[PDB]
Amino acid sequence: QYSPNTQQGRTSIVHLFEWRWVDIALECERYLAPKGFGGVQVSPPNENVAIYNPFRPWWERYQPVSYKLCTRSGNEDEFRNMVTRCNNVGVRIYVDAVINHMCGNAVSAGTSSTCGSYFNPGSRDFPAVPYSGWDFNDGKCKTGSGDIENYNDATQVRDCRLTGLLDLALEKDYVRSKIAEYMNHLIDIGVAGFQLDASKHMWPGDIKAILDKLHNLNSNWFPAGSKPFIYQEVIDLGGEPIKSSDYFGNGRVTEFKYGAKLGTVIRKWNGEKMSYLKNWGEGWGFVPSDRALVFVDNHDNQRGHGAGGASILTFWDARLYKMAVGFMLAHPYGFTRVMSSYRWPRQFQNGNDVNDWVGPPNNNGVIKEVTINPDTTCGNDWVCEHRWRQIRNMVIFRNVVDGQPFTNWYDNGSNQVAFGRGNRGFIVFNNDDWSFSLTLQTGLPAGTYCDVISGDKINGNCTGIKIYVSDDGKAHFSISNSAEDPFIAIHAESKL
Numbered sequence: 001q002y003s004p005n006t007q008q009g010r011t012s013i014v015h016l017f018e019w020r021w022v023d024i025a026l027e028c029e030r031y032l033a034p035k036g037f038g039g040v041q042v043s044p045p046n047e048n049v050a051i052y053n054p055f056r057p058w059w060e061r062y063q064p065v066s067y068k069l070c071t072r073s074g075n076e077d078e079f080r081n082m083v084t085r086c087n088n089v090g091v092r093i094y095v096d097a098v099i100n101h102m103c104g105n106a107v108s109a110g111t112s113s114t115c116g117s118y119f120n121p122g123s124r125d126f127p128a129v130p131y132s133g134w135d136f137n138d139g140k141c142k143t144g145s146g147d148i149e150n151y152n153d154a155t156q157v158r159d160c161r162l163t164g165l166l167d168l169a170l171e172k173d174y175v176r177s178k179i180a181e182y183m184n185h186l187i188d189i190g191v192a193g194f195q196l197d198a199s200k201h202m203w204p205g206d207i208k209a210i211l212d213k214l215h216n217l218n219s220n221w222f223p224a225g226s227k228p229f230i231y232q233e234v235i236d237l238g239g240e241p242i243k244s245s246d247y248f249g250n251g252r253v254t255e256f257k258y259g260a261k262l263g264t265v266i267r268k269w270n271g272e273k274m275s276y277l278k279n280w281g282e283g284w285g286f287v288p289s290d291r292a293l294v295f296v297d298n299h300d301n302q303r304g305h306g307a308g309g310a311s312i313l314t315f316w317d318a319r320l321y322k323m324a325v326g327f328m329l330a331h332p333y334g335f336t337r338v339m340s341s342y343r344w345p346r347q348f349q350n351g352n353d354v355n356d357w358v359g360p361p362n363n364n365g366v367i368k369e370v371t372i373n374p375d376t377t378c379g380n381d382w383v384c385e386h387r388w389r390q391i392r393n394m395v396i397f398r399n400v401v402d403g404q405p406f407t408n409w410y411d412n413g414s415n416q417v418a419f420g421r422g423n424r425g426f427i428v429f430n431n432d433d434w435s436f437s438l439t440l441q442t443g444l445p446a447g448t449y450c451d452v453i454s455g456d457k458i459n460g461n462c463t464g465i466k467i468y469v470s471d472d473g474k475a476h477f478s479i480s481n482s483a484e485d486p487f488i489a490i491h492a493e494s495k496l
Ligand SMILES: *[C@@H]1O[C@H](CO)[C@@H](O)[C@H](O)[C@H]1NC(C)=O
Pocket: 459, 460, 461
């Protein structure tokens, strides 16, 4: 459960938030594979509730109605097609598994679902699964409202409804089998792993029982005995009775402290500085690197919908975001997940965005296709951060330095730091309000290297900044606090 099952050489996965299966299949062949991406995290592929008030919000996909591969992203055929095409090109697929609950208890009964399946939240009836009142822990929850009221009580956090969402009785073998049946269907189709959504709201023991019912990966693409990659979405910022270490026996865990702290440091909040990132990782109280799934932002907290708060950096903070993602991709800690979003009409009223529910670009509810512009960027409101030169090139940077140790650290006691990865890579950052100009030891072989942030290595030449490393590995770096991108990165594969 701890290995991503990515092809040797690929070290990152990208979350193609709300993308259609057909668009992802194309992206796998035309960009992800050639650019060295390891895999893709997809939005929940199972039938969810269709909400028209607000109009088709992004969170409607977190309210399951059944386990039918029928959503706004596509049907089972298109989904199968996407997994096959991506797998055939070396790009894995990871599914966001929503197994802690079903839809809201206050949702209207009827056929307002993405595939027409009938459901009755009030009577706890989900015939398409099927599930009934006996499969929920309404009689197990001990709070007066039936919802989670206090997170200081690990019990109610697991047996009660998360903001009204009907809570599945995961201790029952029947429920465990129905969920495994859904996950095994996906595994036999070709998916390499899963993201267990709302894992904090499930008992580590119940998760284990389910995982024990899962098949090995499809022997047509993976070696015999391959187990699905598992990363549990646990929001643990400390101070709670529930700890993400309690889930180590099931697989990896999402480290939400990673993005939150990285945001405050890059933003220079609370007097924090980049020079403090010297012992970044476990030294900061994070989970062990071999159990961590890291990211700068996620679909939740990028819209103030998740842990991290106002410190979280997103595509809206383009300049600082690129630097944050760059540091993450260059640093050896954990397995990295890159975010890919869409734009929405942010509208802050009282310091709050009242349009944080807006779903993906669409035409009367039908998700718009991902169009590629002549400059490789995207249109139709898709941000496509994974296509940004600075991010795409750093994804490759991580692949090239995979396995290399962290060394040659340098910092000016403020916000000007630099470090390398063995003898395969070097990166420099300038987040101070003044220019940076100094000769640093890169530990790199002599030669001329192309800066992969400002440019590219094309046809035995660089389109951006060029760095000259001497015989003793020293090189001069010059970064003005006015540069579009305040950081420079070079590696073995960007050498001329
Ligand atoms: C690099 O570009 C210049 C023209 O700008 C040209 O003289 C040179 O041959 C190019 N080098 C290679 C290896 O193509």
